[PDB]
């Protein structure tokens, strides 16, 4: 198997910057290397083939280079429809191999998370389960951590981790925490906690509830 | 210079089989070979194989030989890939492409789940409810199957400050979750509701969040 | 656009 | 409180299917579940499924479910498991285990290989050859199929000082290598001779180390 | 899916010490553990169940704590026939679960490898392919690595790499090295050259030779 | 030696 590592693996990048994105191959591949885009939900789109030709619709601001091992592409300068990821393909050999994919983001300041906590709803408590849930929306960058805590206690599973991808106004993210339990087990206890933590302070970001109400 | 067009979204059960097509449009279909490639946020893109409808020639991946069947048929132009024997890690997103073009995946589902209505709860701040200058609601959509569903706040007209994340499994079925934040002022005076819909089982929620006795 | 060169080692 | 044992190595084809049994001895089959699992130097020890020959109950692992069936004859004390749609990731060690007991487990090997004989090359010190205290010789058994190879030095007369590395798969064939180190006086004035044998293609050789040219 | 953390992955002991191997579960398991150990080419060895029972037939020696979320299994004083890999086993809920497995081995001063090279054999080379081969053996401890380079430059793959278990005299490890090429490509360079990083020295452990013969 | 406890989870 031809090995294909693309780096860097995740760039930070401004609209209007020239991008430069590689892919060495283990051996020799006689420049049958594609590079291709995905954008998030849609299938992949060819940008260039046989390591230089660029494909019929694709703007002059890509180009490919390289030869051998190794191969580059360069984004002249980048635009907001660029965003997503990208990948190598070599086509040289069976079995076909792909990179990593090269996942690029808008830079943007810092931001912490505005973290919110919701004790279950009725309606659910009323069923027999019982849902925590745990807001982390609008921070930069994309790291986080999430732990939850029932007295005292972290709990590990029961527990559902969701992100939205880049927003394309604010350019932060966001991330949704559901702990889910069964009403016996969550009657069970008391002070149920959320912590976060993120680049933008050195202690955890920590909301809380205590079910006899706090 | 055109073309792949892909079989529609496929559900299937455990132990069965499943055959995707993949229609080659405007250009010489017995010129190029035609690959089949999986993806799943896993294991990231594999090649599965490929096959070269002039030639008839067929190159596998060594994982998927005895699981996959590659064929082609002239007078459509279609290549055709059989899985068999499927179960939940085969559930992915399938491609066939030319290597430049790309056809537009179909999507196969492995499961044994039944259509089943989603729960919706209502996500009210906790009690006390502090005084910041905005906050934030949130809707809790549980257990459905198969997706999607579409949610909304106050029926489209609530769509500022909105997040819906993406749906996950869990216990072999679907959830989701969004939040809204609004001023303070807003609410609880203006009323917010969450609409839920679920095609699947014709399912249409509409949800008040009042705020925690 | 490309000619089969794409590599078609199946030929 | 007695034992479980499993049949013996299956070598199958990409595509076919196996059955493999599992036979309890010494206590009462009835009472305790059977569990099927699975084992590879990629991905360690994977749970299968199992059932409870007593009540017929049967739970899987989702990652099984479509391609393991798992079936016990009261009759025979004997459990079963049937695996459909064979590729080369299937190829491990399965063992049924009570929980606390375990079967000696059966090696299932998934290849289209045919059997073939081994090249065996001698590979002698670099020309030149220093003046150390000892040489290291060694041989090089090539492409075989399958396993196993049994290789000595001087018909097992020669055994101490001997490295012989366990055979790996390149190409869908098996290679193996071992070496000796010898003092500098015995070689080359002494003969060293490789034998190498392959019951599976009744394959015997032997090869001397000779000095290179 | 209830998570086995065992730890350590990997010890290094002598002969009559104690030994104490652990498994955190994810969530509360009720004490339905497993602890057993394999061998090279052997079966599974169940040595306690339930947490803390002996099985009949395994020395006292062993003896299994632990309740809720931790578990450990002491080894009293280690014998030789003890050496091998520990895994636990949850079987409170399903999925069945194991640990990653505890690889026990005699520790021994450091011992550097000895290296050797060996060109292709004439009986190969008229068979049309070329393979490279290089003994790294008797080394303490286990981590080595081995580059391959063909006219000064690293070669990546073609390359089979081959390990022994510890040596039950002195305690060593041994490897070999296959660098497979067809004689064609074999044929088109001179400088073959086998290196070896190991923690007993600095600087790589180099083995070459010229194919015009040095 | 064990007894179902072991815990036969299908009994």
Redesign the interface.
């Given at each position: 198997?031809?090995?294909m590592t693309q780096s860097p693996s995740s760039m930070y990048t401004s609209l209007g910057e020239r991008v430069t994105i590689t892919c060495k191959a283990?051996?020799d591949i006689n420049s049958?290397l594609?590079w291709?885009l995905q954008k998030p939900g849609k299938?992949?789109?060819?940008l260039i083939?046989?390591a230089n030709?660029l494909?019929?619709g694709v703007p002059s601001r890509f180009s490919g280079s390289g030869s051998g091992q190794t191969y580059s592409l360069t984004i002249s300068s980048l635009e907001y429809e660029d965003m997503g990821i990208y990948?190598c393909?070599q086509?040289?050999?069976?079995?076909?191999?792909?990179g990593?994919?090269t996942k690029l983001d808008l830079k943007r300041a810092d931001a912490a998370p505005?973290v919110?906590?919701?004790?279950?709803?009725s309606?659910?408590l009323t069923?027999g389960?019982a849902?925590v849930?745990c807001?982390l929306?609008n921070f930069y960058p994309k790291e986080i951590n999430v732990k939850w805590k029932i007295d005292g206690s972290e709990r590990?599973?029961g527990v559902?981790?969701?992100?939205?991808e880049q927003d394309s106004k604010d350019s932060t993210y966001?991330?949704?925490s559901?702990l889910?339990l069964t009403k016996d087990e969550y009657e069970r206890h008391n002070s149920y906690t959320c912590e976060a933590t993120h680049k933008t302070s050195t202690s955890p970001i920590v909301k809380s509830?205590n079910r006899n109400?706090? | 210079?055109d073309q792949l067009q892909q079989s529609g979204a496929e559900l299937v059960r455990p132990g069965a089989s499943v055959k995707l097509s993949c229609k080659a449009l405007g250009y010489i279909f017995t010129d190029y070979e035609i690959?089949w490639?999986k993806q799943t946020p896993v294991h990231?893109?594999?090649?599965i194989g490929?096959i070269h409808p002039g030639s008839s020639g067929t190159?596998y991946?060594?994982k998927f030989k005895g699981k996959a069947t590659l064929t082609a048929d002239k007078s459509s132009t279609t290549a055709f890939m059989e899985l068999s024997s499927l179960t939940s890690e085969d559930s992915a997103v399938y491609?066939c492409?030319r290597?430049?073009?790309?056809?537009?995946?179909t999507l196969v589902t492995v499961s044994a789940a039944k259509t089943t209505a989603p729960?919706v709860?209502?996500?009210?701040?906790?009690?006390?409810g502090t005084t910041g200058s905005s906050v934030?609601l949130?809707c809790?959509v549980?257990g459905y199957f198969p997706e999607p569903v579409t949610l909304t706040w106050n029926s489209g007209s609530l769509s500022s400050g909105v997040?819906?994340?993406?749906?996950?499994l869990?216990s072999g079925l679907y959830?989701?979750?969004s939040?809204v934040?609004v001023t303070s002022n807003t609410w609880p005076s203006q009323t917010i509701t969450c609409n839920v819909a679920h095609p699947a089982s014709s399912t249409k929620v509409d949800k008040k969040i009042e705020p925690?006795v | 656009?490309?000619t089969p060169?794409?590599?078609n080692?199946k030929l």
């Open positions: 198997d031809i090995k283990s051996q049958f594609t291709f299938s992949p789109k060819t083939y046989r030709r494909m019929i990948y393909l086509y040289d050999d069976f079995p076909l191999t792909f990593a994919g505005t919110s906590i919701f004790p279950p709803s309606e659910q069923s389960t849902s849930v807001f929306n590990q599973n559902l981790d969701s992100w939205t966001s991330m949704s559901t889910t509830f109400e706090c | 210079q690959h490639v990231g893109l594999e090649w490929g190159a991946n060594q491609y492409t290597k430049d073009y790309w056809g537009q995946g729960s709860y209502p996500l009210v701040p906790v009690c006390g934030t949130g809790l549980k997040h819906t994340f993406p749906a996950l869990q959830t989701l979750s939040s934040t925690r | 656009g490309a060169e794409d590599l080692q």
